[PDB]
Design a protein around this ligand. Structure first.
Ligand SMILES: *[C@@H]1O[C@H](CO)[C@@H](O[C@@H]2O[C@H](CO)[C@@H](O[C@@H]3O[C@H](CO[C@H]4O[C@H](CO[C@H]5O[C@H](CO)[C@@H](O)[C@H](O)[C@@H]5O)[C@@H](O)[C@H](O)[C@@H]4O)[C@@H](O)[C@H](O[C@H]4O[C@H](CO)[C@@H](O)[C@H](O)[C@@H]4O[C@H]4O[C@H](CO)[C@@H](O)[C@H](O)[C@@H]4O[C@H]4O[C@H](CO)[C@@H](O)[C@H](O)[C@@H]4O)[C@@H]3O)[C@H](O)[C@H]2NC(C)=O)[C@H](O)[C@H]1NC(C)=O
Ligand SMILES: *[C@@H]1O[C@H](CO)[C@@H](O[C@@H]2O[C@H](CO)[C@@H](O[C@@H]3O[C@H](CO)[C@@H](O)[C@H](O[C@H]4O[C@H](CO)[C@@H](O)[C@H](O)[C@@H]4O)[C@@H]3O)[C@H](O)[C@H]2NC(C)=O)[C@H](O)[C@H]1NC(C)=O
Ligand SMILES: *[C@@H]1O[C@H](CO)[C@@H](O[C@@H]2O[C@H](CO)[C@@H](O[C@@H]3O[C@H](CO)[C@@H](O)[C@H](O)[C@@H]3O)[C@H](O)[C@H]2NC(C)=O)[C@H](O)[C@H]1NC(C)=O
Ligand SMILES: *[C@@H]1O[C@H](CO)[C@@H](O[C@@H]2O[C@H](CO)[C@@H](O[C@@H]3O[C@H](CO)[C@@H](O)[C@H](O)[C@@H]3O)[C@H](O)[C@H]2NC(C)=O)[C@H](O)[C@H]1NC(C)=O
Ligand SMILES: *[C@@H]1O[C@H](CO)[C@@H](O[C@@H]2O[C@H](CO)[C@@H](O)[C@H](O)[C@H]2NC(C)=O)[C@H](O)[C@H]1NC(C)=O
Ligand SMILES: *[C@@H]1O[C@H](CO)[C@@H](O[C@@H]2O[C@H](CO)[C@@H](O)[C@H](O)[C@H]2NC(C)=O)[C@H](O)[C@H]1NC(C)=O
Ligand SMILES: *[C@@H]1O[C@H](CO)[C@@H](O[C@@H]2O[C@H](CO)[C@@H](O)[C@H](O)[C@H]2NC(C)=O)[C@H](O)[C@H]1NC(C)=O
Ligand SMILES: *[C@@H]1O[C@H](CO)[C@@H](O)[C@H](O)[C@H]1NC(C)=O
Ligand SMILES: *[C@@H]1O[C@H](CO)[C@@H](O)[C@H](O)[C@H]1NC(C)=O
Ligand SMILES: *[C@@H]1O[C@H](CO)[C@@H](O)[C@H](O)[C@H]1NC(C)=O
Ligand SMILES: *[C@@H]1O[C@H](CO)[C@@H](O)[C@H](O)[C@H]1NC(C)=O
Ligand SMILES: *[C@@H]1O[C@H](CO)[C@@H](O)[C@H](O)[C@H]1NC(C)=O
Ligand SMILES: *[C@@H]1O[C@H](CO)[C@@H](O)[C@H](O)[C@H]1NC(C)=O
Lengths: 129, 447, 129, 129, 51
């Protein structure tokens, strides 16, 4: 069942989490000095710049290849106190992003440091023998 | 009971953002080089995808929309890009000696004057017809030597004869990673929450029709007619009106003008008006009085919904500004018309006989408040006639200390952006933020 | 044994599949308003745009890091009826791409949906305990 | 303990290897024909071009997702004769890159060929049953 | 790099490299004439005699 790009924007987070491929596809795809040419070329560079930034974050979180990745960071209750059923079956990703947009930067920092910067050194010392 | 953050890549999350949109138009084939389509606009996809977003409710604000500000600067920049290579009429500021066209008890005048030739040393005397508005007397004492109206303020350039001024449908597209949200609420007013929202990569075919007072060739509001403003209580802010039923307007220039190609330099060519062939009639537009009276009545019904279910609603002619703001200015086949709309806004409301409007023409124009560059519209050969759709209006209250007993509405054209807002009220630009972090009972394997 | 970029374009699919690294390397690597400058800059943006699109498809198929990846999609016989020896030891990638270019779009859709959109949710419910 | 971008440039290779996330983050993140506009747009295209080249090398080495990856290539002593303690606790990445910049191109070639071009075919023949 | 076993169809008359090169020479010419001196005043009437 496909609704299209951003079709599940008003659905529950659990329902929207099933069609992440839909947003992933349409997320990247004599004189040429015309006002349109300058706009187009600058628009194309802006699109690949935003895409590479999100893929950069997935890279430093060790989640490059996957749309759903699990981490080692525990969920600090100060961010949100809501239970799983209330989060995934009562909220949309929009109002969720609004409730957690406040602590997103802190969470992103813990996400790159806590695991993948610790995980890689421990991976070398483990496969060291 | 142990919760852990998990990264989701592709979550339907967006935030309000302003980005650089680009052009997109169908594959229309042909004469050409029309300013807006340009040599190359990205051809529209053979099949557009409009994806309705169920359960979504987004806040809109057509008055703080940045698509309007961008389109405005795009039309202006497109105009200059088309005037740069055309012939500049700097030598056409020679002193003109003009006489009347015979007749007793004159909008156009017969002007003779000397103009340079191909060779620097040689000169030539040529006679060409002009309109009264494009010329002013160089004496006021008075004698009768005239000059062009622009020579005193700014230079002048002749619009190339190949480029056409006819608006064609243009689709404004957003780059990858961004999206456009279209409000499909029929009764959607100016701003507010739009219950029915869908997403599209490019807007519909929007024709950049430059008009004043009256909105032409626009899109018709569905269901009831819409009354959109930024502050109905504030008289200073204009009032956008959108018709549900289009009224028809016929503008013609009955004069059988002629094009006189007079070379003014090596390669440079100036196209002057050639004596008129046939009768001397002035341009004018017609509107059906039955439809306009019907359409105007439907407007007052929606007007009373904001000024009391019963109140005095009168209509008067524009009493502010001059030139562009006082006349229904527009373009038609290459000639720039300026019509008096006093016949349309001349009623009072409480509780086949087609109207005619006088239209005067100019060839020297300064559109979009442009200071420094004027353009000379070359004469169009033959008779000109264009049938257009009057879909919207642009009104304004008179203000004052009237004890709300009576309300008066006059047309106006304060800004050119209001024309773009008449077609961009339903669109909005947002950026997709596909990185979402949520807690689940999942943990990474230490392995 | 290296022949160079596209050297095995006329070889059997099995032989060409051995030197995919060769195509992978050379696949991406007062006024500057000169006609060359506008062409160059626009050419450079075109190269990274095509590369990121193919890497995007590998991402949504869960095959980002690898040149050879196996999937869960079974080979529907309507696409091609040829046996393995006939495909890999009798055909070149060119004439193969011509025989299957017809159903490529359908295959790409099944490739992103059938596994990695199903695989990621089942991966969360499996590592859920 | 964070010092900032390139903070450990004078530290031992072992100490610097702990904060590779720091360098990974800041490694990518009417007429617009102004001299600045042409410089900016050309600068932005240059940044994503260098980033995608390094990520390309990590891709063809099968190390896309990780900052620390182990390989199959043995360390040929002709490159450097130094022991582990002398390398990781006595040298900085700068003077290391200077000592091995000579054989880097050879090492990169062995790194893409020896494992990931051999590893992928053997991975198909292993999961073949 | 020679491509063994490869056989490709060519058509020098429908080649787009030609059309591109043509527009490149033309555009290069105009780019070099723009800053040079324009002889608009050199159209004065000339009175010429034999050598
Ligand atoms: C709101 O929207 C309304 C809805 O569209 C708008 O109404 C439009 O109004 C404009 C005028 O403002 C009209 O444009 C003009 O219409 C003229 C009348 O059209 C008649 O002739 C048509 C010819 O038929 C051909 O095309 C039809 C198209 O379908 C095709 O079916 C047919 O087979 C044939 O190929 C006929 O179809 C019509 O029914 C009418 O009878 C038309 O003559 C105008 O064309 C002029 O002008 C434009 C712009 O100036 C140029 O781009 C054209 O090339 C053409 O100019 C050439 O011809 C002139 C003829 O005299 C010459 O004077 C010129 O110098 C020029 O000649 C040179 O170039 C030629 C081509 O290179 C050479 O061969 C010559 O040798 C010369 O070098 C123009 O199109 C719209 O038609 C009208 N819309 C509709 C639907 O009718 C309204 O304007 C809008 N309002 C606002 C404010 O925007
Ligand atoms: C001047 O104003 C008149 C006012 O009606 C206008 O006539 C109408 O134009 C519209 C297009 O803008 C016509 O609507 C289309 O008609 C075609 C052919 O019948 C249909 O295929 C279309 O169907 C679809 O598209 C609709 C949206 O336009 C969708 O709502 C619908 O779901 C379909 O997908 C479409 O109905 C309309 O028929 C005419 N009206 C009449 C009476 O003919 C005219 O176009 C204006 N002139 C100019 C130059 O703009
Ligand atoms: C505008 O003024 C010009 C004068 O500069 C007018 O041009 C002149 O018009 C008269 C008509 O009254 C022409 O007379 C005719 O001249 C031709 C010459 O071939 C002759 O064959 C006829 O028998 C007749 O005498 C005159 O030639 C013409 N002069 C030039 C230089 O063209 C012009 O008619 C005026 N137009 C308007 C609309 O007022
Ligand atoms: C083209 O025509 C020009 C005339 O405009 C020629 O220039 C003149 O040429 C004569 C030679 O027949 C020169 O006479 C000499 O003048 C000098 C002056 O210093 C004098 O010293 C000599 O004894 C002799 O009288 C004349 O000066 C010269 N005029 C000018 C203004 O330069 C030119 O020679 C012609 N060239 C050709 C190729 O036809
Ligand atoms: C368009 O309709 C919306 C209704 O959703 C109006 O928004 C309200 O306007 C009133 C005054 O007109 C305010 O008191 C409310 O606070 C507004 N509500 C919100 C949620 O903003 C909006 O004013 C209307 N616009 C026009 C021009 O009539
Ligand atoms: C406008 O005037 C021109 C004359 O300049 C008319 O064109 C002439 O039309 C007749 C047909 O009656 C032809 O015999 C001539 O050869 C045409 N001459 C030229 C120069 O075109 C044109 O018909 C007139 N148009 C109108 C609407 O009156
Ligand atoms: C504007 O012109 C159009 C056509 O030039 C007129 O439409 C005509 O209307 C009459 C009825 O009076 C019909 O008999 C014709 O068949 C119509 N013609 C076309 C082409 O549709 C329209 O009435 C005019 N409007 C005004 C206000 O004069
Ligand atoms: C978001 O954070 C700001 C600053 O701490 C706070 O004032 C605001 O109430 C918060 N709103 C949320 C997260 O609901
Ligand atoms: C036109 O030029 C002639 C010769 O230069 C001059 O005598 C005459 O006064 C000029 N007339 C006008 C109207 O400029
Ligand atoms: C407005 O109407 C008055 C009649 O009351 C008229 O005299 C005047 O010329 C009109 N002006 C404009 C700009 O329409
Ligand atoms: C308004 O209509 C009246 C009544 O028919 C008429 O006398 C008057 O001239 C009209 N005025 C304008 C400005 O059209
Ligand atoms: C490719 O597909 C088209 C349309 O189904 C078909 O007509 C053609 O014969 C096919 N050719 C192939 C795949 O050999
Ligand atoms: C680097 O290589 C060059 C060429 O083999 C050699 O001359 C130079 O001594 C070397 N320097 C190093 C690696 O210290």
């Amino acid at each position: 069942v496909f609704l299209g790009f951003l079709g599940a924007a008003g659905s529950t987070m659990g329902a929207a989490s099933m069609t992440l491929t839909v947003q992933a596809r349409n997320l990247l795809s004599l004189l040429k000095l015309t006002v349109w040419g300058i706009k187009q070329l600058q628009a194309r560079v802006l699109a690949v710049e935003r895409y590479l930034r999100d893929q950069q974050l997935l890279g430093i979180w060790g989640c490059s290849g996957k749309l759903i990745c699990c981490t080692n960071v525990p969920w600090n209750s100060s961010w949100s106190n809501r239970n799983l059923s209330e989060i995934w079956d009562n909220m949309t990703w929009l109002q969720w992003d609004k409730e957690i947009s406040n602590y997103t930067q802190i969470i992103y920092g813990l996400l790159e440091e806590s695991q993948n910067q610790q995980e890689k050194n421990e991976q070398d010392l483990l496969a060291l023998d | 009971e142990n919760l852990w953050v998990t990264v989701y890549y592709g979550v339907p999350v967006w935030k309000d953002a302003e980005t650089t949109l680009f052009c997109a138009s169908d594959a229309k084939a042909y004469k050409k080089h029309n300013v807006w389509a340009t040599h190359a606009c990205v051809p529209t996809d053979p099949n557009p995808q409009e994806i309705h977003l169920e359960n979504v409710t987004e806040e809109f604000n057509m008055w703080k929309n940045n698509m309007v500000e961008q389109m405005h600067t795009d039309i202006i920049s497109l105009w200059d890009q088309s005037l740069k290579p055309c012939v500049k009429l700097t030598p056409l500021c020679v002193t003109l000696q003009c006489t009347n066209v015979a007749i007793t008890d004159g909008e156009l005048k017969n002007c003779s004057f000397n103009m340079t030739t191909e060779l620097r040393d040689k000169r030539q005397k040529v006679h060409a017809l002009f309109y009264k508005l494009d010329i002013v007397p160089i004496n006021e004492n008075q004698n009768t030597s005239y000059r062009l109206i622009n020579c005193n303020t700014a230079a002048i350039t002749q619009a190339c004869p190949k480029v056409s001024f006819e608006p064609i449908p243009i689709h404004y597209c957003a780059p990858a990673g961004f999206a456009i949200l279209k409000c499909k609420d029929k009764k959607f007013n100016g701003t507010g929450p739009c219950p029915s929202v869908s997403t599209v990569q490019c807007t519909h075919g929007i024709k950049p029709v430059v008009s004043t007072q009256l909105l032409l060739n626009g899109s018709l509001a569905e269901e009831e007619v819409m009354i959109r403003s930024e502050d109905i209580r504030n008289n200073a802010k204009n009032i956008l009106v959108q018709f549900n039923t289009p009224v028809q307007i016929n503008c013609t220039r009955p004069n059988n003008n002629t094009r006189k190609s007079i070379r003014i330099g090596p390669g440079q060519w100036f196209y002057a008006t050639g004596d008129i062939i046939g009768d001397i009639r002035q341009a004018h537009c017609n509107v059906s009085k039955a439809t306009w009276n019907e359409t105007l009545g439907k407007v007052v019904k929606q007007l009373r919904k904001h000024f009391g279910n019963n109140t005095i609603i009168r209509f008067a002619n524009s009493s502010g500004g001059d030139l562009e703001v006082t006349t229904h200015s527009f373009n038609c086949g290459g000639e720039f018309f300026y019509c008096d709309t006093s016949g349309l806004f001349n009623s009072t409301w409480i509780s086949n006989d087609s109207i005619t409007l006088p239209c005067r023409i100019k060839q020297i124009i300064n559109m979009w408040q442009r200071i420094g560059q004027a353009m000379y519209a070359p004469p169009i050969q033959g008779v000109i006639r264009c049938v257009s759709n009057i879909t919207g209006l642009i009104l304004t209250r008179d203000g004052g200390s009237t004890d709300s007993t009576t309300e008066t509405f006059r047309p106006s054209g304060g800004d050119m952006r209001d024309n773009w807002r008449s077609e961009l009220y339903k669109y909005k630009v947002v950026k997709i933020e596909p990185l979402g972090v949520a807690p689940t009972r999942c943990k990474r394997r230490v392995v």
